[PDB]
CSV table of C-alpha atoms and ligand atoms in Angstrom, one decimal:
chain,number,residue,atom,x,y,z
A,1,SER,CA,4.8,20.0,-0.2
A,2,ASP,CA,2.5,21.5,1.1
A,3,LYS,CA,-0.8,19.9,-0.2
A,4,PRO,CA,-3.9,22.1,-0.8
A,5,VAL,CA,-6.8,20.9,1.5
A,6,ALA,CA,-10.2,22.1,2.7
A,7,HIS,CA,-13.0,20.9,5.1
A,8,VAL,CA,-16.0,23.2,5.3
A,9,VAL,CA,-19.1,22.7,7.5
A,10,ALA,CA,-22.7,23.7,7.0
A,11,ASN,CA,-23.9,26.8,8.9
A,12,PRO,CA,-26.8,25.6,11.2
A,13,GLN,CA,-28.1,29.2,11.6
A,14,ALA,CA,-28.5,29.6,7.7
A,15,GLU,CA,-32.2,28.8,7.2
A,16,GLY,CA,-33.2,27.1,3.9
A,17,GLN,CA,-29.6,26.9,2.6
A,18,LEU,CA,-26.6,24.6,2.6
A,19,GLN,CA,-24.0,27.3,3.5
A,20,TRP,CA,-20.4,26.2,3.7
A,21,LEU,CA,-18.3,27.8,6.5
A,22,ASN,CA,-14.5,27.6,7.1
A,23,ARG,CA,-14.4,30.3,9.8
A,24,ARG,CA,-15.8,28.1,12.7
A,25,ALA,CA,-13.7,25.8,14.9
A,26,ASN,CA,-12.8,22.4,13.3
A,27,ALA,CA,-13.3,23.7,9.7
A,28,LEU,CA,-10.4,24.9,7.5
A,29,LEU,CA,-9.0,26.1,4.2
A,30,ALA,CA,-5.2,25.4,3.6
A,31,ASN,CA,-2.4,25.9,1.0
A,32,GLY,CA,-4.4,28.0,-1.4
A,33,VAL,CA,-7.9,26.6,-1.4
A,34,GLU,CA,-10.6,29.2,-1.2
A,35,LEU,CA,-14.3,29.5,-0.4
A,36,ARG,CA,-15.9,31.9,-2.9
A,37,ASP,CA,-19.7,32.3,-3.5
A,38,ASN,CA,-20.2,29.0,-1.5
A,39,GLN,CA,-17.7,27.1,-3.8
A,40,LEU,CA,-14.3,25.7,-3.1
A,41,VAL,CA,-11.7,27.0,-5.6
A,42,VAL,CA,-8.9,24.7,-6.6
A,43,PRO,CA,-5.5,26.5,-6.4
A,44,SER,CA,-3.3,24.1,-8.5
A,45,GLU,CA,-3.6,21.2,-11.0
A,46,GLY,CA,-3.5,17.6,-9.6
A,47,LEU,CA,-5.4,14.5,-8.3
A,48,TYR,CA,-7.9,15.4,-5.6
A,49,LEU,CA,-10.0,13.4,-3.3
A,50,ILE,CA,-13.4,15.1,-3.2
A,51,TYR,CA,-15.7,14.2,-0.3
A,52,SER,CA,-19.1,15.3,1.1
A,53,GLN,CA,-21.7,14.1,3.6
A,54,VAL,CA,-25.2,15.5,4.4
A,55,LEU,CA,-27.5,14.2,7.0
A,56,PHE,CA,-31.2,14.3,6.2
A,57,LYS,CA,-33.8,14.0,9.0
A,58,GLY,CA,-37.6,13.9,8.7
A,59,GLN,CA,-40.5,13.5,11.2
A,60,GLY,CA,-42.5,10.8,9.6
A,61,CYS,CA,-43.7,10.2,6.1
A,62,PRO,CA,-45.9,12.8,4.4
A,63,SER,CA,-48.2,12.3,1.3
A,64,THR,CA,-46.6,10.1,-1.5
A,65,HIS,CA,-42.7,10.2,-1.5
A,66,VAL,CA,-40.0,12.8,-0.9
A,67,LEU,CA,-36.8,12.9,-3.1
A,68,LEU,CA,-33.5,13.8,-1.5
A,69,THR,CA,-30.5,14.6,-3.7
A,70,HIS,CA,-26.9,15.6,-3.1
A,71,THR,CA,-24.6,16.7,-6.0
A,72,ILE,CA,-21.0,17.8,-6.3
A,73,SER,CA,-20.4,19.9,-9.5
A,74,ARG,CA,-17.3,21.4,-11.2
A,75,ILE,CA,-17.3,24.7,-13.1
A,76,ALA,CA,-13.9,25.2,-15.0
A,77,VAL,CA,-12.2,28.4,-16.3
A,78,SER,CA,-11.5,26.9,-19.9
A,79,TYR,CA,-14.8,27.2,-21.9
A,80,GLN,CA,-16.6,27.8,-18.5
A,81,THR,CA,-17.2,24.0,-18.6
A,82,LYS,CA,-20.0,22.9,-16.2
A,83,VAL,CA,-19.5,19.3,-15.4
A,84,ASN,CA,-21.3,17.2,-12.7
A,85,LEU,CA,-18.9,14.9,-10.7
A,86,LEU,CA,-20.8,13.0,-8.0
A,87,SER,CA,-24.6,12.7,-7.6
A,88,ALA,CA,-26.9,10.6,-5.4
A,89,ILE,CA,-30.7,10.3,-5.0
A,90,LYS,CA,-32.7,8.9,-2.0
A,91,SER,CA,-36.4,8.1,-1.3
A,92,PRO,CA,-36.6,8.0,2.5
A,93,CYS,CA,-40.4,7.3,2.6
A,94,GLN,CA,-41.8,3.7,1.9
A,95,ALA,CA,-45.2,9.4,12.9
A,96,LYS,CA,-41.6,8.1,13.7
A,97,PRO,CA,-38.4,10.0,12.7
A,98,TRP,CA,-36.1,8.9,9.8
A,99,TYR,CA,-32.4,9.7,9.3
A,100,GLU,CA,-30.8,9.4,5.8
A,101,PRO,CA,-27.1,10.4,5.3
A,102,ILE,CA,-25.8,10.9,1.7
A,103,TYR,CA,-22.1,10.3,1.1
A,104,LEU,CA,-20.3,11.5,-2.0
A,105,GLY,CA,-16.7,11.0,-2.8
A,106,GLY,CA,-14.1,10.1,-5.4
A,107,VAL,CA,-10.7,10.9,-6.9
A,108,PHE,CA,-10.7,13.5,-9.7
A,109,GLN,CA,-8.2,15.3,-11.9
A,110,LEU,CA,-8.8,19.0,-11.3
A,111,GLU,CA,-7.2,22.2,-12.8
A,112,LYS,CA,-6.2,25.6,-11.4
A,113,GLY,CA,-9.4,27.8,-11.0
A,114,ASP,CA,-11.9,25.0,-11.0
A,115,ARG,CA,-14.9,25.8,-8.7
A,116,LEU,CA,-16.6,23.0,-6.9
A,117,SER,CA,-20.0,23.1,-5.3
A,118,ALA,CA,-21.8,20.6,-3.0
A,119,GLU,CA,-25.6,21.1,-3.2
A,120,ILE,CA,-28.9,19.6,-2.0
A,121,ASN,CA,-32.5,19.8,-3.2
A,122,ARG,CA,-34.3,20.0,0.3
A,123,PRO,CA,-32.6,22.2,2.9
A,124,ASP,CA,-35.7,21.8,5.1
A,125,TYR,CA,-34.8,18.2,5.8
A,126,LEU,CA,-31.1,19.0,6.6
A,127,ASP,CA,-30.0,17.9,10.1
A,128,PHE,CA,-27.9,20.2,12.2
A,129,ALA,CA,-28.9,18.7,15.7
A,130,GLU,CA,-25.2,18.3,16.5
A,131,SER,CA,-21.8,19.3,15.0
A,132,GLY,CA,-20.0,17.2,12.3
A,133,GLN,CA,-23.0,15.8,10.5
A,134,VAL,CA,-22.8,17.8,7.2
A,135,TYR,CA,-19.4,18.7,5.6
A,136,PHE,CA,-17.6,19.1,2.3
A,137,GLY,CA,-13.8,18.9,1.7
A,138,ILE,CA,-11.1,18.3,-0.9
A,139,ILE,CA,-7.6,16.7,-0.3
A,140,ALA,CA,-4.8,17.0,-2.8
A,141,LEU,CA,-3.1,13.6,-3.4
B,1,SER,CA,9.2,9.0,7.9
B,2,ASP,CA,8.8,11.5,10.9
B,3,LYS,CA,5.1,12.0,10.2
B,4,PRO,CA,2.8,11.0,13.2
B,5,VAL,CA,0.3,8.2,12.2
B,6,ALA,CA,-2.0,5.6,13.8
B,7,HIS,CA,-4.3,2.8,12.6
B,8,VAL,CA,-6.1,1.1,15.4
B,9,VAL,CA,-8.6,-1.8,15.1
B,10,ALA,CA,-11.5,-3.0,17.3
B,11,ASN,CA,-10.9,-5.8,19.8
B,12,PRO,CA,-13.1,-8.7,18.8
B,13,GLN,CA,-12.7,-10.2,22.4
B,14,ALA,CA,-14.1,-7.0,24.0
B,15,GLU,CA,-17.8,-7.5,25.2
B,16,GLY,CA,-20.3,-4.6,24.5
B,17,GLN,CA,-17.5,-2.1,23.6
B,18,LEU,CA,-15.6,-0.6,20.6
B,19,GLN,CA,-12.1,-1.1,22.1
B,20,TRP,CA,-9.3,0.2,20.0
B,21,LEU,CA,-6.1,-1.9,19.7
B,22,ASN,CA,-2.8,-0.9,18.3
B,23,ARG,CA,-0.3,-3.7,18.9
B,24,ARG,CA,-2.3,-6.5,17.4
B,25,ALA,CA,-1.0,-7.0,13.8
B,26,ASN,CA,-1.4,-4.7,10.7
B,27,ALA,CA,-2.4,-2.1,13.3
B,28,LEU,CA,0.0,0.6,14.5
B,29,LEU,CA,1.0,3.9,16.4
B,30,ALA,CA,4.0,5.8,15.0
B,31,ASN,CA,6.1,8.9,15.6
B,32,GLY,CA,4.5,9.9,19.0
B,33,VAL,CA,0.8,8.9,18.6
B,34,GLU,CA,-0.3,7.2,21.9
B,35,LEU,CA,-3.4,5.1,22.6
B,36,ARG,CA,-4.7,6.2,26.1
B,37,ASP,CA,-8.1,5.5,27.7
B,38,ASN,CA,-9.4,4.3,24.2
B,39,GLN,CA,-8.3,7.7,22.7
B,40,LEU,CA,-5.6,8.6,20.2
B,41,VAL,CA,-3.3,11.4,21.7
B,42,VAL,CA,-2.0,13.9,19.1
B,43,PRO,CA,1.8,14.3,19.5
B,44,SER,CA,2.4,17.6,17.6
B,45,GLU,CA,0.4,20.5,16.0
B,46,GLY,CA,-0.6,20.2,12.3
B,47,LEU,CA,-3.1,19.1,9.6
B,48,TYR,CA,-4.3,15.5,10.1
B,49,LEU,CA,-6.5,13.3,7.9
B,50,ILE,CA,-8.8,11.6,10.4
B,51,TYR,CA,-10.6,8.4,9.2
B,52,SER,CA,-12.9,5.7,10.6
B,53,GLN,CA,-15.2,2.9,9.6
B,54,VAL,CA,-17.5,0.7,11.6
B,55,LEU,CA,-19.5,-2.2,10.2
B,56,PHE,CA,-22.9,-2.9,11.7
B,57,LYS,CA,-24.7,-6.2,11.2
B,58,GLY,CA,-28.1,-7.2,12.4
B,59,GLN,CA,-30.3,-10.3,12.0
B,60,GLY,CA,-33.6,-9.0,10.7
B,61,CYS,CA,-35.7,-6.1,11.8
B,62,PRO,CA,-37.1,-5.9,15.4
B,63,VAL,CA,-33.2,1.2,15.7
B,64,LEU,CA,-30.7,3.9,15.3
B,65,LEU,CA,-27.0,3.4,14.5
B,66,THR,CA,-24.5,6.2,15.2
B,67,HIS,CA,-20.7,6.7,14.8
B,68,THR,CA,-18.9,9.8,16.0
B,69,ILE,CA,-15.3,11.1,16.1
B,70,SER,CA,-14.8,13.9,18.7
B,71,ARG,CA,-11.9,16.1,19.8
B,72,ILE,CA,-11.0,17.1,23.3
B,73,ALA,CA,-8.4,19.8,23.2
B,74,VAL,CA,-5.8,20.2,25.9
B,75,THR,CA,-16.0,17.8,27.1
B,76,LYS,CA,-16.0,16.2,23.6
B,77,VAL,CA,-16.7,18.3,20.5
B,78,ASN,CA,-17.9,16.3,17.5
B,79,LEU,CA,-15.6,16.5,14.5
B,80,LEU,CA,-17.4,13.9,12.3
B,81,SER,CA,-20.8,12.3,13.0
B,82,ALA,CA,-23.3,10.1,11.1
B,83,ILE,CA,-26.7,8.4,11.9
B,84,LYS,CA,-28.2,5.4,10.1
B,85,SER,CA,-31.7,3.7,10.2
B,86,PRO,CA,-31.1,0.2,8.9
B,87,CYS,CA,-34.7,-0.9,9.6
B,88,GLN,CA,-37.4,0.7,7.4
B,89,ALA,CA,-35.2,-12.9,9.5
B,90,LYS,CA,-32.7,-11.9,6.7
B,91,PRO,CA,-29.4,-10.3,7.9
B,92,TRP,CA,-28.4,-6.6,7.1
B,93,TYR,CA,-25.0,-5.0,6.9
B,94,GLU,CA,-24.5,-1.2,7.3
B,95,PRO,CA,-21.0,0.4,7.3
B,96,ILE,CA,-20.5,3.9,8.6
B,97,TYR,CA,-17.6,6.0,7.2
B,98,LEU,CA,-16.2,9.1,8.8
B,99,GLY,CA,-13.3,11.2,7.6
B,100,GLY,CA,-11.8,14.6,6.9
B,101,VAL,CA,-8.8,17.0,7.3
B,102,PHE,CA,-8.6,18.8,10.6
B,103,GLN,CA,-6.2,21.2,12.3
B,104,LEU,CA,-5.1,19.5,15.6
B,105,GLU,CA,-2.9,20.6,18.5
B,106,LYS,CA,-0.3,18.8,20.8
B,107,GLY,CA,-2.3,16.9,23.5
B,108,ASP,CA,-5.6,16.7,21.7
B,109,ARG,CA,-7.4,13.5,22.4
B,110,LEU,CA,-9.6,11.9,19.7
B,111,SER,CA,-12.2,9.3,20.3
B,112,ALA,CA,-14.2,7.2,17.8
B,113,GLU,CA,-17.5,5.9,19.3
B,114,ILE,CA,-20.7,4.0,18.5
B,115,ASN,CA,-24.1,3.9,20.2
B,116,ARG,CA,-24.8,0.1,19.8
B,117,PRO,CA,-21.8,-2.2,20.2
B,118,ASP,CA,-24.3,-5.2,20.1
B,119,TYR,CA,-24.7,-4.6,16.4
B,120,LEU,CA,-20.9,-4.3,15.8
B,121,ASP,CA,-19.4,-6.8,13.2
B,122,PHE,CA,-15.7,-7.8,13.7
B,123,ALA,CA,-16.2,-11.5,12.4
B,124,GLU,CA,-13.5,-10.6,9.9
B,125,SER,CA,-10.3,-8.6,10.2
B,126,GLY,CA,-10.3,-5.1,8.7
B,127,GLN,CA,-14.0,-4.4,9.2
B,128,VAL,CA,-13.8,-1.7,11.9
B,129,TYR,CA,-10.9,0.7,12.3
B,130,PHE,CA,-9.8,4.3,13.3
B,131,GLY,CA,-6.7,6.1,12.3
B,132,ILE,CA,-5.0,9.5,11.8
B,133,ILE,CA,-2.4,10.5,9.3
B,134,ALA,CA,-0.3,13.7,9.6
B,135,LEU,CA,-0.2,15.6,6.3
C,1,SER,CA,13.4,8.4,-5.5
C,2,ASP,CA,11.1,11.2,-4.0
C,3,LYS,CA,7.9,9.3,-2.8
C,4,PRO,CA,6.5,6.0,-4.3
C,5,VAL,CA,2.8,6.6,-5.4
C,6,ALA,CA,0.1,4.8,-7.5
C,7,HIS,CA,-3.5,5.3,-8.6
C,8,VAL,CA,-5.0,2.7,-10.8
C,9,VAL,CA,-8.5,2.5,-12.3
C,10,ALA,CA,-10.8,-0.4,-13.3
C,11,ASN,CA,-10.6,-1.4,-17.0
C,12,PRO,CA,-14.1,-0.6,-18.4
C,13,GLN,CA,-13.6,-3.2,-21.2
C,14,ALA,CA,-12.7,-6.0,-18.8
C,15,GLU,CA,-16.3,-7.3,-18.2
C,16,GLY,CA,-16.7,-9.7,-15.3
C,17,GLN,CA,-13.4,-8.7,-13.6
C,18,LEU,CA,-11.9,-6.0,-11.4
C,19,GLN,CA,-8.9,-5.3,-13.6
C,20,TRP,CA,-6.6,-2.5,-12.5
C,21,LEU,CA,-5.1,-0.3,-15.3
C,22,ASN,CA,-1.7,1.4,-15.0
C,23,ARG,CA,-0.6,5.0,-16.0
C,24,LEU,CA,2.6,4.1,-11.1
C,25,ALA,CA,5.5,6.3,-9.8
C,26,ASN,CA,8.9,5.9,-8.1
C,27,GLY,CA,8.8,2.0,-8.2
C,28,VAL,CA,5.1,1.3,-7.3
C,29,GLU,CA,4.5,-1.3,-10.0
C,30,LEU,CA,1.2,-3.0,-10.7
C,31,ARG,CA,2.6,-6.5,-11.4
C,32,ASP,CA,-0.1,-9.3,-11.1
C,33,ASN,CA,-3.3,-7.2,-10.8
C,34,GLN,CA,-1.5,-6.2,-7.5
C,35,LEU,CA,0.4,-3.1,-6.4
C,36,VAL,CA,4.0,-4.2,-5.4
C,37,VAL,CA,5.6,-2.2,-2.5
C,38,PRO,CA,9.0,-0.8,-3.8
C,39,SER,CA,10.5,0.1,-0.4
C,40,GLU,CA,9.9,-0.2,3.4
C,41,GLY,CA,7.8,2.5,5.0
C,42,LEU,CA,4.4,4.0,6.0
C,43,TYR,CA,1.8,4.0,3.2
C,44,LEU,CA,-1.7,5.4,2.9
C,45,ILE,CA,-3.7,2.7,1.0
C,46,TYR,CA,-7.1,3.8,-0.5
C,47,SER,CA,-9.9,2.3,-2.6
C,48,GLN,CA,-13.5,2.8,-3.9
C,49,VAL,CA,-15.9,0.5,-5.9
C,50,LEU,CA,-19.3,1.5,-7.3
C,51,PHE,CA,-21.9,-1.2,-7.4
C,52,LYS,CA,-25.1,-0.9,-9.6
C,53,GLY,CA,-28.1,-3.2,-9.8
C,54,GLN,CA,-31.3,-3.1,-11.9
C,55,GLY,CA,-33.8,-3.8,-9.1
C,56,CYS,CA,-34.0,-6.3,-6.2
C,57,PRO,CA,-33.8,-10.1,-7.0
C,58,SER,CA,-33.6,-11.2,-3.2
C,59,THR,CA,-32.2,-9.9,0.2
C,60,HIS,CA,-29.3,-12.4,-0.2
C,61,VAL,CA,-27.4,-9.9,-2.5
C,62,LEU,CA,-24.1,-9.4,-0.6
C,63,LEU,CA,-21.5,-6.9,-1.8
C,64,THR,CA,-17.9,-6.9,-0.5
C,65,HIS,CA,-14.8,-5.0,-1.1
C,66,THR,CA,-11.4,-6.0,0.4
C,67,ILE,CA,-7.8,-4.8,0.3
C,68,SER,CA,-5.3,-7.7,1.2
C,69,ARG,CA,-1.6,-7.8,2.0
C,70,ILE,CA,0.6,-10.7,0.8
C,71,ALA,CA,3.8,-10.0,2.9
C,72,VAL,CA,7.1,-10.9,1.1
C,73,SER,CA,8.4,-12.6,4.4
C,74,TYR,CA,5.3,-14.8,5.3
C,75,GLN,CA,3.6,-15.1,1.8
C,76,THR,CA,0.0,-15.4,3.2
C,77,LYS,CA,-3.2,-13.4,2.2
C,78,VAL,CA,-4.4,-11.2,5.2
C,79,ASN,CA,-7.3,-8.6,5.0
C,80,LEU,CA,-6.1,-5.1,5.7
C,81,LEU,CA,-9.4,-3.3,5.0
C,82,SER,CA,-12.8,-4.8,4.3
C,83,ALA,CA,-16.5,-3.8,4.1
C,84,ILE,CA,-19.9,-5.6,3.4
C,85,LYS,CA,-23.2,-4.1,2.0
C,86,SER,CA,-26.7,-5.5,1.6
C,87,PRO,CA,-28.2,-3.2,-1.1
C,88,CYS,CA,-31.6,-4.9,-1.2
C,89,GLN,CA,-34.0,-4.1,1.7
C,90,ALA,CA,-43.7,-4.0,-9.5
C,91,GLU,CA,-41.4,-1.9,-11.8
C,92,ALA,CA,-37.7,-2.5,-10.5
C,93,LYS,CA,-35.8,0.8,-9.7
C,94,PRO,CA,-31.9,0.7,-10.2
C,95,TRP,CA,-29.8,1.0,-7.1
C,96,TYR,CA,-26.2,2.4,-6.7
C,97,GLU,CA,-23.9,1.4,-3.8
C,98,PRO,CA,-20.3,2.6,-3.4
C,99,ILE,CA,-17.8,1.0,-1.0
C,100,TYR,CA,-14.9,3.0,0.4
C,101,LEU,CA,-11.6,1.7,2.0
C,102,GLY,CA,-8.5,3.4,3.4
C,103,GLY,CA,-5.8,3.5,6.1
C,104,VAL,CA,-2.1,3.9,7.0
C,105,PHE,CA,-0.1,0.7,7.1
C,106,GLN,CA,3.6,-0.3,7.6
C,107,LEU,CA,4.7,-2.2,4.5
C,108,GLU,CA,7.9,-3.9,3.5
C,109,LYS,CA,9.8,-4.2,0.1
C,110,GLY,CA,8.0,-6.8,-2.0
C,111,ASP,CA,4.6,-6.7,-0.3
C,112,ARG,CA,1.8,-7.2,-2.7
C,113,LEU,CA,-1.5,-5.5,-2.2
C,114,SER,CA,-4.8,-6.5,-3.9
C,115,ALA,CA,-8.2,-4.8,-4.1
C,116,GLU,CA,-11.0,-7.2,-4.7
C,117,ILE,CA,-14.8,-7.5,-4.9
C,118,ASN,CA,-17.0,-10.6,-4.7
C,119,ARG,CA,-19.6,-9.7,-7.5
C,120,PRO,CA,-18.0,-8.1,-10.6
C,121,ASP,CA,-21.4,-8.6,-12.4
C,122,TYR,CA,-22.7,-5.7,-10.2
C,123,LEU,CA,-19.7,-3.5,-10.9
C,124,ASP,CA,-20.4,0.0,-12.5
C,125,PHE,CA,-17.5,0.9,-14.9
C,126,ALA,CA,-19.5,4.1,-15.8
C,127,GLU,CA,-18.4,6.6,-13.1
C,128,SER,CA,-14.5,5.9,-13.4
C,129,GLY,CA,-13.5,8.6,-10.8
C,130,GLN,CA,-15.2,6.2,-8.5
C,131,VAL,CA,-13.7,2.7,-9.1
C,132,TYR,CA,-10.0,3.1,-8.2
C,133,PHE,CA,-7.2,1.8,-6.0
C,134,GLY,CA,-4.0,3.6,-4.9
C,135,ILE,CA,-1.1,3.9,-2.5
C,136,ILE,CA,0.9,7.0,-1.3
C,137,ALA,CA,4.1,6.7,0.6
C,138,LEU,CA,4.2,9.1,3.6
D,201,LIG,C1,-8.0,7.5,3.6
D,201,LIG,C2,-8.9,6.8,4.4
D,201,LIG,C3,-10.2,6.5,3.9
D,201,LIG,C4,-10.5,6.8,2.6
D,201,LIG,C5,-11.8,6.4,2.1
D,201,LIG,N1,-12.1,6.9,0.8
D,201,LIG,C6,-11.6,6.3,-0.4
D,201,LIG,N2,-12.1,6.9,-1.4
D,201,LIG,C7,-12.8,8.0,-0.9
D,201,LIG,C8,-13.5,9.0,-1.5
D,201,LIG,C9,-14.1,10.0,-0.8
D,201,LIG,C10,-14.1,9.9,0.6
D,201,LIG,C11,-13.4,8.9,1.3
D,201,LIG,C12,-12.8,8.0,0.5
D,201,LIG,C13,-9.6,7.5,1.8
D,201,LIG,C14,-8.3,7.8,2.3
D,202,LIG,C1,-17.8,9.9,1.1
D,202,LIG,C2,-17.1,8.8,1.6
D,202,LIG,C3,-16.5,8.8,2.8
D,202,LIG,C4,-16.6,9.9,3.6
D,202,LIG,C5,-16.0,10.0,5.0
D,202,LIG,N1,-14.5,9.6,4.9
D,202,LIG,C6,-14.0,8.4,5.4
D,202,LIG,N2,-12.7,8.4,5.2
D,202,LIG,C7,-12.4,9.5,4.6
D,202,LIG,C8,-11.1,10.0,4.2
D,202,LIG,C9,-11.1,11.2,3.6
D,202,LIG,C10,-12.2,12.0,3.4
D,202,LIG,C11,-13.4,11.6,3.8
D,202,LIG,C12,-13.5,10.3,4.4
D,202,LIG,C13,-17.3,11.1,3.2
D,202,LIG,C14,-17.9,11.0,1.9
């Protein structure tokens, strides 16, 4: 004990970005995890549960189809290795509103100093109507 | 173990509601967590892993499905929320998952809610639950 | 002696099965494709499975994932956690559908937990950090 954990939420006031915040109520950084250049920094080696959710919302279907992506990536200290951990793609269009959440999660072996990022392609479709709809977090097992 | 924990399941005999049940097998409340007015009451300050799952089931497409966990510290403030559009007479199944690590205080009341209990699927045990685990 | 724990992963060479591979701490033994509880207590049970299909054959494509308890006292299979998914809602596009399961349960010495799927033909042994099963004693 005690286990490194983090749960960061998107800043709804940050236009055209997916900006992670830990300095708002119901968001945290604990036992060594850090938020640096919009990335979570792993404090110690071990098995981590990495999780993320983004809610996309559009107002109808415009010309052809829109692609929505959400990716979690890991940049390591050794060899500055840039690996891609979890990724998902969605085509919401096939004027009434649509809602498309993207979930990303898994158990990974991480090392001290690994920097994890949770990114999207279209921040214009990001939904911040209410709180708790878009978050990113890691839990040490 | 001294760690406060809870794993509550939906009552399949509750009409048009998502009613959490604790003492109805494989479900529990431990080390101070109490189930009051369909809310889990946090017994002590600390880091908690909050989790939830709801399974929605419809028969064809005639619709928005939502599932929210909210905190009321000692008006609800959403911790975790998700929205799903299952319709874009074959049946559809749509699970909604909610979870994360939160800093909670003694007396905080957590609720796990849905907008349409008519689409809720509890035909099988283990298909709709809500719990908290102290870290 | 400290805290029984386990994290198993699907065997990528076992085609047509969800076979859990070992390498399991402080007594949590994977005995018959099942995790065997070594002592009484509160356990956090977790699981994930990734499904992948090549297109849509019909809307009758049902995907399930279930964690079951076979209690050492009664000896009957009961669902602890379960979830169902309908991935199918021309040049067929591949689809990916993960299923997540987890919770805190009171388990007894000898209890056997299994993590099963209905269609192993749709299982995607490619992501790895995505098809797993584990328990952590609290
Ligand atoms: C406890 C309750 C539920 C869960 C659900 N869960 C299982 N693997 C996951 C990966 C990412 C996010 C959630 C995940 C885990 C632990
Ligand atoms: C992916 C899958 C599930 C989720 C939401 N989620 C449900 N149980 C969880 C337990 C721990 C963390 C996240 C969890 C988010 C992203």
